[PDB]
Amino acid sequence: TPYEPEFQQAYKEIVGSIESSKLFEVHPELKRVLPIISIPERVLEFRVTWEDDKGNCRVNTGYRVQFNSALGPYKGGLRFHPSVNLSILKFLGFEQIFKNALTGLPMGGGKGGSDFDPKGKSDNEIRRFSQAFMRQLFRYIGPQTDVPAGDIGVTGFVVMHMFGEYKRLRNEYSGVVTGKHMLTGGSNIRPEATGYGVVYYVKHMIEHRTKGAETLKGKRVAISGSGNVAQYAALKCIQEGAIVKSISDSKGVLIAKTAEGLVPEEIHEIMALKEKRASIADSASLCKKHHYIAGARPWTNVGEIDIALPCATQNEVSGEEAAALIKQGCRYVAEGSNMGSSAEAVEVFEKSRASGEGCWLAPGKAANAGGVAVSGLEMAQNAQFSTWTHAEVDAKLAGIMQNIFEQSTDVASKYCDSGSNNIPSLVDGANIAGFLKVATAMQAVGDWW
Amino acid sequence: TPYEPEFQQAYKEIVGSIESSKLFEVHPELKRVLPIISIPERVLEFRVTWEDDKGNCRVNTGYRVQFNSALGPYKGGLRFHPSVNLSILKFLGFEQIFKNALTGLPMGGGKGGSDFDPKGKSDNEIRRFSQAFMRQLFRYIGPQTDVPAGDIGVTGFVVMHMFGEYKRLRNEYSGVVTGKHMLTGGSNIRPEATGYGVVYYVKHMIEHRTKGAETLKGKRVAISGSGNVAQYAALKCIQEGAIVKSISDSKGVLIAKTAEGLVPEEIHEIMALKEKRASIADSASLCKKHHYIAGARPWTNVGEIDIALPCATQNEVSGEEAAALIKQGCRYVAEGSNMGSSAEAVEVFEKSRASGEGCWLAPGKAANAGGVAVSGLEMAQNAQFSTWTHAEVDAKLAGIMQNIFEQSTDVASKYCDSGSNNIPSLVDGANIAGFLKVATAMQAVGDWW
Amino acid sequence: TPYEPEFQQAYKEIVGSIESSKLFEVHPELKRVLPIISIPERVLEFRVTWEDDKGNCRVNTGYRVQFNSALGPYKGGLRFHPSVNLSILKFLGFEQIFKNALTGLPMGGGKGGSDFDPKGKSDNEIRRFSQAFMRQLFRYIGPQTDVPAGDIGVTGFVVMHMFGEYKRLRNEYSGVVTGKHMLTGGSNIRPEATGYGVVYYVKHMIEHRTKGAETLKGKRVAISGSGNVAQYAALKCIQEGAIVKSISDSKGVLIAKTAEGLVPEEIHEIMALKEKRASIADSASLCKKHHYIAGARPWTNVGEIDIALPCATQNEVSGEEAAALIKQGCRYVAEGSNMGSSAEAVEVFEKSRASGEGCWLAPGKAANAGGVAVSGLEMAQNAQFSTWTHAEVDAKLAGIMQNIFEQSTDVASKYCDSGSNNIPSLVDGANIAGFLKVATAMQAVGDWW
Amino acid sequence: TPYEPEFQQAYKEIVGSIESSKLFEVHPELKRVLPIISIPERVLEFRVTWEDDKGNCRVNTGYRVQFNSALGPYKGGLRFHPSVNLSILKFLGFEQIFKNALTGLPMGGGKGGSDFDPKGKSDNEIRRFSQAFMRQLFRYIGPQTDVPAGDIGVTGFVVMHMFGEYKRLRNEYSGVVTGKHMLTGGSNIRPEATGYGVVYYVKHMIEHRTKGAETLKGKRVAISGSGNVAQYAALKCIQEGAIVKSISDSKGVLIAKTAEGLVPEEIHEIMALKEKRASIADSASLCKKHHYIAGARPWTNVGEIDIALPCATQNEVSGEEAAALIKQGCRYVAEGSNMGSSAEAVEVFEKSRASGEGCWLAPGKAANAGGVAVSGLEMAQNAQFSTWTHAEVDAKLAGIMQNIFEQSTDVASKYCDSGSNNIPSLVDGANIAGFLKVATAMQAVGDWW
């Protein structure tokens, strides 16, 4: 039995929500599910051998965790980052079970990736790695078996290289991956889906907490990250009349120097930088206009703030940063990143919600579900031999995020207690709602009794 | 060439309708189809070895008759009953060809099952048997090959155990079976579909026979059986304002002691008894309130009656019972059960229709088609990556049953003669309509020339 | 549960040997095997549609009984005869389990065929039927799964058409069938193997019964049948210095009119007749030279006789014929045909052995095993990428038949009682030896416990 | 990157032999192999769900490490022990690469198993677990892909249950596993092979070290373990005229109380105890006759000794025990167990060899190779459709062990230095010989360049 801190972190939060609720008082038989659900159905690791631009034989480790398939084929992204290991991918894959359950679409949970580092690699090297990766993975996936997509380090470029290699090796053209190109079975809204869905979720939070007194307009938002989720979270914020006060990467943070915050052209500039695996610091002009802080996160540096959207990586909000956010005025936190808040930050936010200023955390498995939701929609369009409009997909996305919110608050009211401020735990509601659905389907298919 | 009485019975009725009609005068080439269509495309038998709760090695025989696939993949239920043998399953599978053709959905015909007896078995034993059965069957079925579901003795519990075992063994999540759980690709209305569709069919019969003078409201209905088909036939009858005067099982019959008949809470009580494989006699309270007759069928015991719905098993209405029904006032018979009426009962009812009181039999292959129709709809929802509403499925079901009625009366008028009472044979119309469609598709795919 | 007389006959003889022996006194747990072993692992039936020389759409039923695979892949011949049905093929497939066990080669037991009648068909029609048959069967067989060969009505012509169709459909060249052509993975001695092995077995019988006082030289032999087994039994008899007094077909019997009996040129003439599906009666010259009896079997017509070799079909020796054989001097009977002796004939011969003149029956599952033995050798040569010499295969065949004899007498002495004449039952010894081996392997692989 | 101590231990010893030798001076390009070879080609983990005798849903983790396939299909045993995890199975699978290379047979290296604990389980539970395990593994193995067999906790009973389940699920009868039953493609000598091969290896050690002055006769041997390897090592020792002074299990050690040591009937008694998963302590009579020490290993308790055969598990000889062995007279150590000697014990023995009393360690990857060698021979017999005699297999085994010895000493002389006592390192020679072969084949197939 090995040391898997991130997996254990994610497991402890979920199980804590469940065990602290009335669920096992009402349904004591469900206790039997926990030892079973927490062992993946299957894990694959494989050597990935590839050739660099200098002709050297290179090697990296690849993985696919197929955690749960009670509700559908395994579904979840691929992460290319030098930190990747089994522990991280188990955290993500376990989260993904419950997140996918919340969407209402027929998707099991999985996650995979490699310790391959895209930084410093050419597009040629990345194509070659992608192809080599898929030459290991193809036999273990399929449109009704396991449907990947892109997570950290895995762009449309990578996903599409993988689609191409699968279609060649299996000699079929199907919905094996999502995040595809629009000419090859892609969905409108898929690039935008995660970040748009985070912001949709926040609109439901503001409505509920203010009992309809306020909207997202004029809210000051601190975003971290500068990739797929952060970009479109920032762009949706701006569309909705909110103020984007920060954006960040692994090297530092850009703090807007105007009360109007960052504007769309600036997000597009950063998008172009990240397409070339460059850093925010590499725009001399953005840095001179705004306030660039090498080595820092946004949270303690953004001044007065209303919303925080962690959109980079796990454990990117410390307990100290959570408390600083609240002192700076923050009352809504929604995780674009998977497990963005550290365990200590979760506790700070949950105590605020219960007893303090009422700062309200939406967990990633609810708030960030828009991406995998629109992936499900991509699967549906592929099966239907159809391509829906932007408006059609966005409306479905909005309806899904609303349903996740409603499931979360309904389940929290049924099994939990909100505390002094009467603000239900989105953390507890998402965990319990997702677990109950999966456990029920598991029982039907024979996974436990 | 072996003795297969039930198969021969079912074959003789179908062929009699066809040969007594003008069909082969108009299309003499169709005579060539009969020797071909009546040999199944394929039959599988397999040993099913399993372990009882005492640890003993047990064995039963399993089967899948894949009768015809001109119109689609094989489709039809699985029956667990100690009577099961090849003859019975051929009867059912041959019927199923024509029934499935009538639905208008792309479904071939098949049937399977085992002589395994669920009575006296634990849920644990039933899970184990289900899994063992599917470990024999899986290689011969698939979402575009052969899609089973539940018949006598095969509940959602069994179907879902089988789905789980298939998905594990084939490592894919697809519409391999219908009658699935709502969290795992099930359809709304599927449990209700057969019994609801029987009653829908009867409404068309009353409208036609009374030329719009009467409705189902207030009609006194004798139901046999107490399982999936009988339960929802009884509940639909009550919803429609009819009076349910009986319900039965293999041990006896409950006759209502009030003119109001049985009420929904009583049907639900019986439903709960049957979930535990108990008998009607095991409710002391139901028996004390009503009139329980050990060892009897409803037909001669229900007093005055308007409709008879055989919803248990084949050959459950004798010729003597048919005549007694008519003396008791019965003018509509609709088979929920497959081949519920004995050959002698069919003749009594067809002569009544032609020349007597006008008592009108709807054959199972028309009246009971709602179940496999909604199975087809479940296949469509699975393929579409969609879950339709209850209202949406029920409306489709109603439209299918109406279309089966119209096909039946249209074809009877075209090729047959109704006799003195001008009431077209639903028996003959269903048989000829179904046969013509299948024969036409067979010719296209090369099965005959 | 259907009427399967031939299966029941074969089962009753085997089980009688076992239950009348000490086996279940020594190993009482083996009683549990009988209900399991007697249900085939799998049965396939399929429609076989084909086109005659006049262009008509024709249909026949095909079958493959896969009875037992504890010792190896299913193995056994295909029979084309209008009598064929499931009962007959179950008899043969059940026999084949035990026969294959006796050979010592890794072969399970199965049998298949069709009610297709080769008589009156052209070679063109037979090619077409063969191909159609294999287009149904191919997915259920394979070199390590189920390896057919030719039984009644299935010649090398048929087997090779089937090989060709399999290799095309599966795009591989392997030992899927035995009885192949020498240019396509055939074995030397395979055509001769059954009839040669029968005569080898008889040599062991004469040695044992006469305690080395006599040989096969000069023995007068009555053979029935005129196909693959009879031909080479007759030719081996002649090589060994015995006298062939008869040969027969479905239309009548040729009795030799000389004490020298039939000569090889006459057997070759009949071979050529049977290649064209003609009858013995169609040689005017053979009939004029010898004594042809329309409608008769040899047994009561051959005059004085020492050995009887039933080599046509099941139940071709009545109890009355058995008694007549003994009155005519017969002291050895060896079944070339499967279950050649009727149940009443078996009893006559077993009582003779025990208490009378000492007439000694060798059951087909021992005496006729040479064919499937050399099939196993063909499988070994295919796997090895090798073709052994005639001498090499014949020596292996001889060694196998000797080992079957030794196993039979050793097991009979261990578990049975020979009676007054001290001649062990070859019937009982073969049945018990074969059953013990299969039961032991079944237990190891989990088929029973 | 996780903590994998056993894997790291095994890797460090191998790489130390290689890096301390002249190999990379002669062939510097081989340095590139180490980062590649040490990442498995593939790892599978899977949940194994099963039912205990009380009907409870149980779960365990299963694994198959497919480490290297340059020389053949993956090959190596399955271990059922509550300690099992990925680290242990990687140690074993990495060892297995090199061991399999040394045999000269075309076998890659792998290992798998489960944390399932057979102790306290019924044979029924073990059958059920075995079957469930194989229902997870079957798709990832095959006769030309990955061929398992039995390691700690995996008996013929388990292996054969697994064969049965594979043959059912894949519908083929092939050499998917080795260690099979003799009626189902087993090899003679396979049960005996590991322990016999250890003792064969020791005979070569004595010949070499004493320059032909001494033999194994009369040598006093301390054996640990009491399972498959220990039993047949003890029985071979006795056949060869050596004295068995100990045998042990996880609960304690039996020290012989006579100078004649243990006799074959005593080993057979222990064999029967271990078939029932009982302990040595459970024989009151053995314990009363001899000297039983609860909680102890043999090494410091056996008195004067010449040979030590660790035959239980990894790290079962401490550095202190190694030094005590030498003080007690031990001059030969041969590992029946994989990595039986701790790292500290290896160093004690290698310094003795180099500079001290000349105590000589043979590593498991050489000494214990007889088991997988005879597995390879079982694969060859299966492919050939043949069963070789005991004598034939034992002669091949003896020839393999001699060849492993010769390869080891030849390679040690070529690339290493023996030290003062002129006794070549069997440790270094096995590691380098095995690595060079695998690296060469890897290069040919494109695994590195």
Ligand SMILES: NC(=O)c1ccc[n+]([C@@H]2O[C@H](COP(=O)([O-])OP(=O)(O)OC[C@H]3O[C@@H](n4cnc5c(N)ncnc54)[C@H](OP(=O)(O)O)[C@@H]3O)[C@@H](O)[C@H]2O)c1
């Ligand atoms: N994409 C989806 O559909 C989706 C859906 C749900 C949730 N998520 C989650 O959203 C987060 C971001 O994913 P993405 O798709 O936007 O990936 P992305 O496009 O690769 O962007 C990741 C961003 O996070 C930063 N980052 C990554 N790892 C970091 C680390 N260890 N320390 C600090 N900064 C780090 C990167 O910095 P650099 O630019 O300096 O490299 C970059 O700005 C992840 O937690 C992911 O699991 C993604």
Ligand SMILES: NC(=O)c1ccc[n+]([C@@H]2O[C@H](COP(=O)([O-])OP(=O)(O)OC[C@H]3O[C@@H](n4cnc5c(N)ncnc54)[C@H](OP(=O)(O)O)[C@@H]3O)[C@@H](O)[C@H]2O)c1
């Ligand atoms: N389910 C479908 O979708 C479907 C569709 C079309 C037609 N059908 C037909 O409808 C009938 C009932 O099926 P079901 O799904 O309702 O099965 P079910 O749930 O198993 O119920 C069967 C009922 O019939 C009784 N029964 C069964 N075999 C009997 C026999 N030999 N003698 C007397 N009573 C017997 C049972 O009595 P106990 O409760 O005492 O056991 C029970 O009340 C069958 O003819 C079936 O083929 C079913």
Ligand SMILES: NC(=O)c1ccc[n+]([C@@H]2O[C@H](COP(=O)([O-])OP(=O)(O)OC[C@H]3O[C@@H](n4cnc5c(N)ncnc54)[C@H](OP(=O)(O)O)[C@@H]3O)[C@@H](O)[C@H]2O)c1
């Ligand atoms: N071939 C093998 O390797 C093999 C091995 C072991 C045992 N057997 C058994 O040996 C017997 C003969 O097989 P075979 O391969 O020699 O077949 P074959 O070449 O087709 O010859 C069959 C012979 O038996 C006659 N016959 C068949 N069915 C008959 C019936 N119902 N009534 C009377 N005569 C009948 C045929 O008469 P016509 O010539 O008039 O048609 C013909 O002479 C069978 O019992 C078979 O199962 C065969």
Ligand SMILES: NC(=O)c1ccc[n+]([C@@H]2O[C@H](COP(=O)([O-])OP(=O)(O)OC[C@H]3O[C@@H](n4cnc5c(N)ncnc54)[C@H](OP(=O)(O)O)[C@@H]3O)[C@@H](O)[C@H]2O)c1
């Ligand atoms: N079998 C093969 O072909 C083969 C080939 C090469 C090498 N090996 C190696 O040989 C060794 C023994 O394998 P085997 O096949 O003989 O297994 P086995 O039949 O299961 O016997 C294992 C023996 O070792 C003892 N044991 C196991 N784990 C132990 C632990 N953690 N602490 C102390 N004692 C322990 C057991 O004690 P209990 O009886 O108390 O349970 C038993 O006496 C292993 O290292 C294995 O990898 C086996």
Ligand SMILES: N=C(CCC(=O)O)C(=O)O
């Ligand atoms: N990266 C994902 C989802 C990938 C997908 O759309 O399957 C996530 O939910 O974190």
Ligand SMILES: N=C(CCC(=O)O)C(=O)O
């Ligand atoms: N039990 C069935 C139908 C099963 C199905 O829905 O395929 C029937 O039509 O009798």
Ligand SMILES: N=C(CCC(=O)O)C(=O)O
């Ligand atoms: N016809 C056979 C054997 C066919 C074969 O060689 O597999 C028989 O044993 O009856």
Ligand SMILES: N=C(CCC(=O)O)C(=O)O
């Ligand atoms: N248990 C094994 C070998 C298993 C096998 O024979 O494949 C070993 O070498 O440790």
